[PDB]
């Protein structure tokens, strides 16, 4: 039972700025013989496997950029990134190996950037789906910032249940988010109406972005 805790749980930093994150162990990870701290740092980018950054609390693993620095001792450890880069977007985990192994809960590092308006696209159900009796209408809202965004579905002018949304992880190069919205109907229901509208509301404009089609 060695309890590992990290802080903060999440934060966002602009490219070029310094980043500091903390890791605490419920007891010392120090080997008195060697004076080595059994504390390691791992980086996990969206959709990737964990990657070793730092071990012995302060030793940089081969291939790791110099901007990454580990320090601390005893029960308190820090991971520091100077000049954060867009690609540094990740969850960072500390891990003690003094007594078996235990990961902390991780720190989620996101990247702050300039506000960006979404590019919105609407897609009608495919004929192959309609043939089976189903009718999914899809809206993509791509490459925006910040993450906060509202999608409104309207059918024949009346707002519309049956809506499922999904956001991507932040983009590793341009630090934008994207989002998908799918309104699923029956074919019978789909054929009752003509106009289908996807309205995006984002702080980047006072007016909703409106995309639509007629059946």
């Amino acid at each position: 039972d060695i309890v590992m805790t990290q802080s903060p749980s999440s934060l966002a930093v602009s490219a070029g700025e310094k980043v500091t994150m903390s890791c605490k162990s419920s007891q010392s990870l120090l080997n008195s013989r060697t004076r080595k701290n059994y504390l390691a740092w791992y980086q996990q980018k969206p959709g990737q496997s964990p990657k070793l950054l730092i071990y012995w609390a302060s030793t940089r693993e081969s291939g790791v950029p110099d901007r990454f620095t580990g320090s601390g001792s005893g029960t308190d450890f820090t991971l520091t990134i100077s000049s954060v880069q867009a690609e540094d977007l990740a969850v960072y985990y500390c891990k003690q190996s003094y007594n078996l192994r235990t990961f902390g809960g991780g720190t989620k590092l996101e990247l702050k950037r300039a506000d960006a308006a979404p590019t919105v696209s609407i897609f009608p159900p495919s004929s192959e789906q309609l043939t089976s009796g189903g009718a999914s209408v899809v809206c993509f809202l791509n490459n925006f910032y910040p993450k906060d965004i509202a999608v409104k579905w309207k059918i024949d002018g009346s707002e519309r249940n049956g809506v499922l949304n999904s956001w991507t992880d932040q983009d590793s190069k341009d630090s934008t988010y994207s989002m998908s919205s799918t309104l699923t109907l029956t074919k019978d229901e789909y054929e009752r109406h003509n106009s289908y509208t996807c309205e995006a509301t984002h702080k980047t404009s006072t007016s909703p972005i409106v995309k639509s089609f007629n059946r």
């Binding site: 985990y93 495919s126 993509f140 499922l164 989002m179």
Partner: protein
């Protein structure tokens, strides 16, 4: 180069059993401790077990979370790591990684998990295996997509033009609803390359051995 490849992941019922495997190469297998680590969707990494090297007699250790339920073992003849899992429960649903652990007997020894596999996914559920339906999404630049709807369990993989198209791709994380996942993937290309050039999404769903190629045609 060091290489670690997990396999064995799939769907399994509550109370059931499942064995994972991990093929390794690029290093002297027996010199190294090996660990398994898991991560439930959207949650933190969780160390589960390790098995020590030859110098240590290949002894094993487990986290309290899996002790008495999971068994780690290794086949040194062909350099495989195994994880036998019994009495599985929903909380065990996760991606499982094998990782190369320490070699205390080397002068260059240092304490870390220095290499990781890609991971193999495990879902513990009574729900049924269901293949996806794959639908095309078509309307300066133009955006297209594929809708991968109503499948179980995770994961699926999506590529475009066999991976040739990778720029301007967005694959949206799956969303579960009524025992079935749906996810979508978008791609943006120049208006001059479509429809005048073929755009195809490739979708795989290992649990049902589904392989689908879907061409995007205007309409």
């Amino acid at each position: 180069e060091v290489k670690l490849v997990e396999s064995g992941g799939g769907l399994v019922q509550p109370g059931g059993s499942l064995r994972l495997s991990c093929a390794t190469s690029g290093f002297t297998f027996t010199d190294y401790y090996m660990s398994w680590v898991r991560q439930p969707p959207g949650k933190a990494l969780k160390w589960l077990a390790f098995i020590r090297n030859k110098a240590k007699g290949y002894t094993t250790e487990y986290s309290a979370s899996v002790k008495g339920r999971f068994t780690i073992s290794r086949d040194n003849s062909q350099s495989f790591l195994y994880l036998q899992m019994n009495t599985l429960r929903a909380e065990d649903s996760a991606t499982y990684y094998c990782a190369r652990d320490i070699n205390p007997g080397s002068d260059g020894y240092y304490d870390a998990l220095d290499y990781w596999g890609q991971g193999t996914s495990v879902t513990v559920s009574r729900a049924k295996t269901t293949p996806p339906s794959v639908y095309p999404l078509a309307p300066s630049m133009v955006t297209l997509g594929c809708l991968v709807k109503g499948y179980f369990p995770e994961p699926v993989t999506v590529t475009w033009n066999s991976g040739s198209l990778s720029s301007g791709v967005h694959t949206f994380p799956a969303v579960l609803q009524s025992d079935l996942y749906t996810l979508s993937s978008s791609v943006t290309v120049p208006s001059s390359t479509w429809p005048s050039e073929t755009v195809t999404c490739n979708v795989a769903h290992p649990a049902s051995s589904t392989k689908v190629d879907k061409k995007i045609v205007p309409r």
